[PDB]
Amino acid sequence: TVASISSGPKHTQKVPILTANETGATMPVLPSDSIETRTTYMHFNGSETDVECFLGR
Amino acid sequence: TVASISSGPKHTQKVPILTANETGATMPVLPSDSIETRTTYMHFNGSETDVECFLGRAACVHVTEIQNKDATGIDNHREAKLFNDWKISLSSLVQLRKKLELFTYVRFDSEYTILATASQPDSANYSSNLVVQAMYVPPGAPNPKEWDDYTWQSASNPSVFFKVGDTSRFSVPYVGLASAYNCFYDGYSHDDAETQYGITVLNHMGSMAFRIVNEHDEHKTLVKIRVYHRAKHVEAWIPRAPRALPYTSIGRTNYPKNTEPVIKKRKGDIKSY
Amino acid sequence: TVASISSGPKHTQKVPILTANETGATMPVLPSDSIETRTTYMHFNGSETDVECFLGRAACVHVTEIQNKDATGIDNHREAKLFNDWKISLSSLVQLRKKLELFTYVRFDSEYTILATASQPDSANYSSNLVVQAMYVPPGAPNPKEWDDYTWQSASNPSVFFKVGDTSRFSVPYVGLASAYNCFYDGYSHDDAETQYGITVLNHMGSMAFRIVNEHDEHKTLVKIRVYHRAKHVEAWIPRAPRALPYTSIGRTNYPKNTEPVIKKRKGDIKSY
Amino acid sequence: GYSDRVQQITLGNSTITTQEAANAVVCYAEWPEYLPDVDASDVNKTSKPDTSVCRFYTLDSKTWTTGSKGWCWKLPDALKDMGVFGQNMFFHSLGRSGYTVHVQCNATKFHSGCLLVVVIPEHQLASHEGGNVSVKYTFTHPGERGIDLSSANEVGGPVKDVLYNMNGTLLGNLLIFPHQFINLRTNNTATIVIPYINSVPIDSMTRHNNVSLMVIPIAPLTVPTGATPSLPITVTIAPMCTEFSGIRSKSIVPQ
Amino acid sequence: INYYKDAASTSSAGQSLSMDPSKFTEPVKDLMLKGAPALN
Amino acid sequence: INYYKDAASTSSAGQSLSMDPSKFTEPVKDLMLKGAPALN
Amino acid sequence: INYYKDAASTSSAGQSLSMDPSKFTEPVKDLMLKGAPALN
Amino acid sequence: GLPTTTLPGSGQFLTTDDRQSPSALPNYEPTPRIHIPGKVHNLLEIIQVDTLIPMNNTHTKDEVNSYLIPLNANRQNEQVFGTNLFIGDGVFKTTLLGEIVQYYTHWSGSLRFSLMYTGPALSSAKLILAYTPPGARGPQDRREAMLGTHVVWDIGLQSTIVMTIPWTSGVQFRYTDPDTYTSAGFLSCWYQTSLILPPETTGQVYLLSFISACPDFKLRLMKDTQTISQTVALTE
Amino acid sequence: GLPTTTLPGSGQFLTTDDRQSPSALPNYEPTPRIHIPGKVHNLLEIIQVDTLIPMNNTH
Amino acid sequence: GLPTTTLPGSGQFLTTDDRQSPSALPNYEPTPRIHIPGKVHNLLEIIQVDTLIPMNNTH
Ligand SMILES: Cc1cc(CCCCCOc2ccc(C3=NCCO3)cc2)on1
């Protein structure tokens, strides 16, 4: 799984970082929408935040 | 496997025993390069020198003590050993320490065994079985203040309850923040002029806290806790020179002043046997 | 299997019962060589005379004793039995000893059982469960000096913790330096004129050390340790004459002076029944 | 006619030639390489100035005399002020690097003396005070000057006792670390290639030094009769495969 | 048989049986052959 | 191996490995595409 | 079933069922047959 | 309910046993491993790297000088140094080899002892190193020494000489803590001809000496080292 | 009778262990589940919804 | 957790029982065996060698 993909300079008409929060959504913006990133992998599953785990001790 | 091959007289232009140590290598010279040998087999694998084996037996890492007594009128439970804690660390007791510091970075799961024995110093009667509670308190968790705080509810924090005289055992995965634990760290936590130097800054693993669950009887009971640690699934990188001088502190390399010569002086000459 | 075959009258030139013992042989003569027999079967295998069976049951090899008491002001823990040790050896108690010395060289794994029972000689109260620590101290290891030395950390040395009244059990591979243990050794450790003679020089197996982990209660408690040893995976070479006279020392063959006749004198003649 | 003996290292816009080498050591048998993605954590693209940072900087020279005890430099500290390497260093949040270290000391066939040149990963120093006294920052960040083991104890500084490696271990066992000797009779330089060694993929270049280079006289310098009793030792070091990441405002560090 | 779900809970690991001293005993850049001259 | 007959007696459940934040993060009636204008 | 890894930890060995007294009862160099004269 | 019987040893804690345990942190995910040069797998890997021996032990406080074996110009027939081979004690004891051997009870195998010469390049010398196998005394003169394992070393361009102490033994293991029965011999070194310095040169020259184990080597039965102890627990 | 040995840790209660237990109510039938909008499976699902920060903390 | 019942005899030590035990020295390698003439397997092997009888016991 990639945690971040590689992304480079941008000069577009397509701006993912401008939104309208009045709508009630949290738009899924990522580091790679606003800086230049390199690939990295997650190495993690989110196992210990499962509700079974959270309420299970 | 052969430990030595058979080899006979030599009169060559090819001399394996002359080398240049300035290069930094240790050339793999064998008995058969300089005497006449006979075949012999190894009969041995080097099993018990594997690092998993070397670091894999339980070592005592900590001895603490708590007492069961009437807390009535005690203004500071922590101070009365009504419960006590331990700022987890593996460098406080120094037998296991020298073994680990043969390496720079080490990675392993831990298996803890906790033995708790009771002592009744002041002539006594009937001892009612005490149950110890060991609970792990990680960094940024409500540290406990009395021996019976809400903290001990430990609703999200792993805790084990066992009886004095018995042993508790459980195993914790490698909890390091990086890829390995640093046995050494030549750095600071930030570039301040007075911040501590060493690892102590690095191995912020929080502390472990013990208490007796029982209320008090008429006499007082001393319970002494011994924590044993066994590394399992060991991985070690970069060997270093063994520790020669005595240790003075958890987490610093410092040795004591006016220490004694560590190399044994000859009783005789260089020429002596 | 037949134990005896059927055999009838004989009038031969072939006499199996006349031999020459000067040769060193024991000729395999049977009932059927000299009387008339009938067939009979063995019905038996000789199972319980196998050397694995003969040396394979636990035998008491050592009884020692340690006490739990206030060490305050004791200048010599070892001497107060605050802990004690044992210079491992298998020849100190002599029931198992005669059995082993039927052979010259013996090779086996050991299974140890350690029973520890407590005694309270001086009229007492409540006895808090004592936990014994047995730790193996091999040759060239920091011998322990107080009952709570760094030694007891035992970070590299196998140690077992069990409760008084219980038993501890574990098994140690054949730790001999050679291919077998010498039951006898007609040699010295070197050609000096005054060095000891025997095996004691050979079976340098180091010692075992016991202590109570508990601090002291108001009364004193005597704990007496019994070590049992069972050979498993036995291999024995070269049978010898059984021991006739009493033993005097661990590791020497010496018998006591003015000992008594070991062969029972007849009450009567050679002719007596 | 290639000898183990003559060598040329060209890195960036700078070249070194030695006509009296004794092979070269590559720590742990690994050559410096960039940070692979599979090992990456920070999502930032890194900056690889290449030839402007991966060239040879020659630190100021030392003087070996019969009384010398040895010198110690820390990396990347020693280079904190060299050209654009240094700027990059103070300006990014994180950086990573390997190095080629070339230590130089020539004499004549009448001199004797032998230096140990060793690289120690994570050399945590000891306070000469004992107990749990710390070693202040400035003291472990001597810069190009390095630490002079024959200088006096100072307060908040490290211990400078050579038979103990500045940490409670014996000089004799430093040989377990990648190292090379300079024996006037054999050798005139020592070269060690250092791959990046850390427990994290990239780190801060200012709060943590990841190797100390140590040059220690072991067989005392002995000059021919009526020779001047000393020789200079020069250390030239080149960052290799350097990467910087997390650019911003420019760190301010004590002293 | 593992009775437990997590990997940390399993017993000790089993012998590397890896063993390669050359990273420590011969970290030289140009390969040295035993028997050939050290410095050419 | 379950040793007991009833389901309540079995151990903890195993990870949902479900995970879908959109019911919480994007409950909008007309779909919003990142990059397209929020309000047209 | 061995529960333990090392061989020393296994139970007792099992009967040799070897049994050959001749090394002890007839170590003579030239073979003696029962019934034939001992000394010829 | 399945019928069971518990055996002797139940409830004991043996620091050396290896079993499974419940994890206190169910479901936790450890940090990924990244690559780090230098991984060690066996202590046998590292005792083959040679380290310096403080052979010149004759000082009174630890000094860099006890690593230096001095050589005198123009002496003939004489003896350069001597030592027994109790690798767990004496000169050997602080070396990495000595230091590891001390974690085990028994050792067997060949040792590699080398000497690197540091004198001016225009000097010359011929030394003899001799290994004396157990059973005889430390040699008292070269004649005595030369009848056992020996190497005539000719000081040249090639700066170091590697002597091997081949495993000579009845018993297949020796004790690391010095023991008689189990003793390994002596090592001595003498002038074969003599050190000669060039003109304009003077004084003593020194040899550095190293020790490492051959690939031959075996160590077994781990135990605690006499090389480290303590009187109270340390704190931060 | 099968021979056993008990290990260190026997009888301990670790609040984080996960094992089987006898049901006190053998054979009881729980109420059927009906559908309810909003099921949460991971805390990671919810920390992606944004909430307001009291940034102006100065009161 | 599997349900068990312990029988009479639990915890006893019978010097003649034969079971497995943990090795105190995990991974240790014993010295190789070499050949030695004279191996004994059964006491039945040796009681077939004849020995002298002090028949004249009258002393
Ligand atoms: C280096 C180095 C390595 C270590 C050991 C780290 C161990 C991780 C944290 O240790 C514990 C200890 C106890 C418990 C515990 N949970 C319930 C009872 O005890 C959990 C984690 O410390 N320093």
Ligand SMILES: Cc1cc(CCCCCOc2ccc(C3=NCCO3)cc2)on1
């Ligand atoms: C002949 C002959 C044979 C023997 C027996 C040798 C046994 C080897 C060493 O014995 C022990 C004893 C105890 C322990 C021990 N480890 C942890 C607790 O006890 C280990 C080895 O002694 N003499």
